[PDB]
């Protein structure tokens, strides 16, 4: 199985280019895309080596980089121009899909704040038209900005099969808190570490989690509640890493309860004490879970790249993510009373209201029906 990545807008190209640099250095791949002498299954993200990227001014600075051998602002303006080059960009994808052995999914890296955001919303719909059996995971990044943000939300709630949220307000606070930057090329260092760590169990094979659906099938309970948040602690026993991930200071998100948790421990930790820690974390009751259906916490180990110590990443599904949509929602209404049909905004405003209504009702003892 293989996973084709797409990079849209200024953000997608930058965080994708930094994702590939980190992923090339994590492996034994020279900047000239040639394997150096110096186990890690790399057929999923690299093609025999060529990355399976589809990039869409910034391209020139990439081509002037040492990695050249590795390959307006409205939403309506970003939607229309994609329609006029509909056939163009798909030929690149159609040859890469059929040239691929057995396609699995489509990773999308884009910022929803505007030509790239508009182009993204267009492409997300067409992929549902052509390929019905391919997952679409989107590494969206949150910030007329309220308008564009909610429109793409209308597509991300019914088209994208999964979604991992990364908001700049939580990342910028971290850079000033634990990095003391006072830049885009600086916070992207953290975004690259989370992205590279997200697909760790795919490149280093283990007994479990050898496919992208294996990670997603546990967290997302119903096709509607497909939003996730992240947590990265080291900015050492396994009990220490679990307790530091469940603190609010580390999450990348600005009653409520958890639906499912996945922990990625990438160190050389002792794999015999991992089952012990899950016995004791349950006793302190550090996290509150859904009352309707059963839920648990998941811990998965891996191996760090020797060519480059314990780290940790936490993928969670918390209903407190509903607050982020509320801010965009409330920000939209204030502009709607202040200034060919303007009916698409009405439908998008309505459908996101149902998503928020699902979350607040997802925390009740009778979410069934």
């Amino acid at each position: 199985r293989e996973i084709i990545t797409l990079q849209l807008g200024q953000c997608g190209n930058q965080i994708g280019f930094e994702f590939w640099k980190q992923l090339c250095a994590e492996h034994g791949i020279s900047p000239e895309g040639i394997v150096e002498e110096f186990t890690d299954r790399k057929d999923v993200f690299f093609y025999q080596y060529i990355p399976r990227a589809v990039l869409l001014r910034v391209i020139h600075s990439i081509l002037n980089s040492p990695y050249a051998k590795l390959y307006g602002n409205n939403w309506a303006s970003g939607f229309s121009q994609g329609e006029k080059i509909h056939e163009d960009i798909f030929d690149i994808i159609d040859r890469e899909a059929d040239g691929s052995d057995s396609l699995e999914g489509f990773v999308l890296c884009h910022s929803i704040a505007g030509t790239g955001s508009g182009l993204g919303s267009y492409l997300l719909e067409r992929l549902n038209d052509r390929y019905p059996k391919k997952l679409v995971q989107t590494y969206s990044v949150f910030p007329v900005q309220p308008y564009n943000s909610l429109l793409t939300l209308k597509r991300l709630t019914q088209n994208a099969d999964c979604l991992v949220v990364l908001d700049n307000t939580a990342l910028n606070r971290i850079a000033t808190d634990r990095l003391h930057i006072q830049s885009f090329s600086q916070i992207n260092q953290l975004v690259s570490t989370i992205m590279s760590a997200s697909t760790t169990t795919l490149r280093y094979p283990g007994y479990m989690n050898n496919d992208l659906i294996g990670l997603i099938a546990s967290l997302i309970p119903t096709p509607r509640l497909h939003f996730l948040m992240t947590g990265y602690t080291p900015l050492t026993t396994v009990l220490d890493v679990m307790r530091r991930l469940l603190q609010p200071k580390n999450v990348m998100v600005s009653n409520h309860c958890y639906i499912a948790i996945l922990n990625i421990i990438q160190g050389e930790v002792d794999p015999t004490q991992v089952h012990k820690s899950l016995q004791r974390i349950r006793e302190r009751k550090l996290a509150n879970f859904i009352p309707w259906g059963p839920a648990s916490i998941q811990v998965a180990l891996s191996r760090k790249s020797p060519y480059l110590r314990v780290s940790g990443l936490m993928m969670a599904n918390h209903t407190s993510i509903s607050s982020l949509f509320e801010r965009t929602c409330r920000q939209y209404d204030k502009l709607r009373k202040r200034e060919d049909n303007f009916d698409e905004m009405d439908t998008s405003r309505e459908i996101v209201q149902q998503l928020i209504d699902e979350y607040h009702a997802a925390t009740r003892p009778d979410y069934i029906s």
């Binding site: 002498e37 110096f38 020797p306 060519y307």
Partner: protein, 176 residues
């Protein structure tokens, strides 16, 4: 025979040759390399075979020992792995490059007696041994190996240090 077999160890810049005195040829020859992960230490052919997952070191790259920690590992490998003998049970004759610093000679001696507890040992200049093998005690030897070449005038069994010349051109350079 009352005496145990004596060992002969030729320390080469690229390949070490080891065996037993009296034999017509060395019993083992292996790369003068020690490797550690990028089993904790790899020496000889194995280090070469698994170089992909190791960082290689060449402790006697140009004929002169530069890292005694890894040279000690090469000698350990020589006795226990290649020859399968206990050094404390056999005298050991070691070879050295021409113009080998005096301090290095003392170091080799101390290591054999204190680290390997050899019952006896001796060190001879490589070029001199080659001359002996040809049935002579006088002559000039042109020794060209892997990482270094030397022209060594020898008279009556004694190398003449003032006339010895070193040429940093050998097999390695020719291969490249």
């Amino acid at each position: 025979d009352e005496e145990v077999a004596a060992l002969v160890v030729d320390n080469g810049s690229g390949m070490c040759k080891a065996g037993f005195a009296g034999d017509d040829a060395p019993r083992a020859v292996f790369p003068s390399i020690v490797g550690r992960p990028r089993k904790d230490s790899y020496v000889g052919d194995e280090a070469q075979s698994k170089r992909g997952i190791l960082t290689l070191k060449y402790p006697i790259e140009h004929g002169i020992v530069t890292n005694w920690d890894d040279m000690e590992k090469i000698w350990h490998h020589t006795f226990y792995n290649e020859l399968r003998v206990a050094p404390e049970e056999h005298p050991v004759l070691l070879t050295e490059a021409p113009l080998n610093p005096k301090a290095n000679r003392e170091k080799m001696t101390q290591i054999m007696f204190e680290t390997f507890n050899t019952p006896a040992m001796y060190v001879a200049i490589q070029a001199v041994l080659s001359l002996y093998a040809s049935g002579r005690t006088t002559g000039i030897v042109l020794d060209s190996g892997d990482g270094v070449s030397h022209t060594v005038p020898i008279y009556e069994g004694y190398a003449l240090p003032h006339a010895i010349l070193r040429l940093d051109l050998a097999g390695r350079d020719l291969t490249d």
